[PDB]
Amino acid sequence: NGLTVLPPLLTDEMIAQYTSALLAGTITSGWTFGAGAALQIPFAMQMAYRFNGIGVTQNVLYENQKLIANQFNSAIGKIQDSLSSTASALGKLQDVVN
Amino acid sequence: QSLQTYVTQQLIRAAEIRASANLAATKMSECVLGQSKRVDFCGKGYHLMSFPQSAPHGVVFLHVTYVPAQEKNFTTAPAICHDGKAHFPREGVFVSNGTHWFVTQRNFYEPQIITTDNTFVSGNCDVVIGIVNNTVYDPLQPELDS
Amino acid sequence: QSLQTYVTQQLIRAAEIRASANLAATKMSECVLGQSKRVDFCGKGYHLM
Ligand SMILES: *[C@@H]1O[C@H](CO)[C@@H](O[C@@H]2O[C@H](CO)[C@@H](O)[C@H](O)[C@H]2NC(C)=O)[C@H](O)[C@H]1NC(C)=O
Ligand SMILES: *[C@@H]1O[C@H](CO)[C@@H](O[C@@H]2O[C@H](CO)[C@@H](O)[C@H](O)[C@H]2NC(C)=O)[C@H](O)[C@H]1NC(C)=O
Ligand SMILES: *[C@@H]1O[C@H](CO)[C@@H](O)[C@H](O)[C@H]1NC(C)=O
Numbered sequence: 305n306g307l308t309v310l311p312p313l314l315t316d317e318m319i320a321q322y323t324s325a326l327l328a329g330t331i332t333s334g335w336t337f338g339a340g341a342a343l344q345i346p347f348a349m350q351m352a353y354r355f356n357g358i359g360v361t362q363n364v365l366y367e368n369q370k371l372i373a374n375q376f377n378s379a380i381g382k383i384q385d386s387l388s389s390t391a392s393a394l395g396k397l398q399d400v401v402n
Numbered sequence: 403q404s405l406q407t408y409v410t411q412q413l414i415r416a417a418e419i420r421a422s423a424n425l426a427a428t429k430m431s432e433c434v435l436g437q438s439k440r441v442d443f444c445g446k447g448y449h450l451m452s453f454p455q456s457a458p459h460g461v462v463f464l465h466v467t468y469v470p471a472q473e474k475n476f477t478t479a480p481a482i483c484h485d486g487k488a489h490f491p492r493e494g495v496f497v498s499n500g501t502h503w504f505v506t507q508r509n510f511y512e513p514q515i516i517t518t519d520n521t522f523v524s525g526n527c528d529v530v531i532g533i534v535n536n537t538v539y540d541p542l543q544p545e546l547d548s
Numbered sequence: 549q550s551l552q553t554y555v556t557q558q559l560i561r562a563a564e565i566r567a568s569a570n571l572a573a574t575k576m577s578e579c580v581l582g583q584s585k586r587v588d589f590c591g592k593g594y595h596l597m
């Protein structure tokens with residue numbers, strides 16, 4: 305009854321190409337792609353800067369790199385298990401749609 | 403009904419202006435009266451300072467920012483092996499121009515000779531993934547030897 | 549119509565109180581649970597606690 309729905313300007317594929325670029329910037333270059341050009345840096349050295357930014361001396365990362373990497377990989381695993389099992393995790397977005 | 407429609411949309415528009423006045427008041431405090439660590443809050447680049455200029459029903463911030471330029475690619479390492487010791491930079495990163503090793507600060511290329519003054523020890527060569535052997539100059543040593 | 553006028557102004561006023569509760573929740577996290585480097589966020593002067 306005169307209701308219409310207009311499409312978004314960015315397609316969900318364009319949105320996913322922006323999140324791809326933000327990931328690939330963050331992983332390959334740290335914060336530096338926000339400050340200017342993406343300065344490449346090895347991810348373990350970027351992680352050692354990020355440790356120095358919480359006041360934990362960077363050797364604590366290099367001397368524990370296998371453990372810190374396993375804790376990251378394993379925590380990303382548990383994100384999938386949460387989202388796959390628990391649709392009510394998306395409760396803010398589904399509430400807006402409702 | 404026409405006046406109620408106008409007042410309702412002015413009340414919703416006043417809330418948008420007030421959200422923008424709260425943002426402007428916060429950029430005043432953090433960008434102008436301070437220096438901001440909040441990324442892209444006080445403009446793109448690393449924030450240095452901001453200057454407010456007034457405008458009709460608004461404010462304009464001239465955000466001065468340091469933007470880095472003229473990258474060089476270098477070989478890099480997490481740590482340096484010396485006499486069993488693993489050395490890490492106190493500040494900066496290890497970089498190499500192919501054949502020699504330096505420590506530089508992170509946001510500008512200023513290569514310094516690697517020493518016990520610009521690096522700190524922790525543990526030994528075995529642990530670190532990708533440590534690279536190079537001498538670490540101890541500045542005291544020539545002062546005793548001379 | 550006087551009920552819709554009331555509920556409309558209360559929906560708008562709720563959004564002003566929610567903006568102030570989002571601000572008070574932010575002040576709680578940054579000022580109380582932390583120490584804030586944000587100038588004038590946790591009062592004038594350099595913030596201690
Ligand atoms: C890497 O940096 C070092 C130090 O700046 C360079 O070594 C110097 O090079 C000049 C020109 O050949 C010589 O006059 C100096 O005597 C060298 N110093 C030392 C301590 O050997 C080196 O040439 C650079 N290498 C590259 C590939 O850029
Ligand atoms: C850095 O130096 C170490 C020690 O000089 C090298 O590793 C081995 O160390 C033992 C003594 O701890 C020596 O007996 C071996 O000869 C060394 N192996 C080699 C292949 O030299 C280490 O290899 C050096 N850096 C490198 C290339 O990783
Ligand atoms: C760094 O090296 C790669 C090749 O390994 C090259 O494509 C790139 O342009 C270089 N970047 C700079 C800033 O020199």
Ligand SMILES: *[C@@H]1O[C@H](CO)[C@@H](O)[C@H](O)[C@H]1NC(C)=O
Nearest residue numbers: 346478479480531532533534
């Ligand atoms: C980088 O990878 C190579 C093999 O591709 C490996 O031999 C080297 O030790 C690694 N260096 C660092 C700093 O991780």
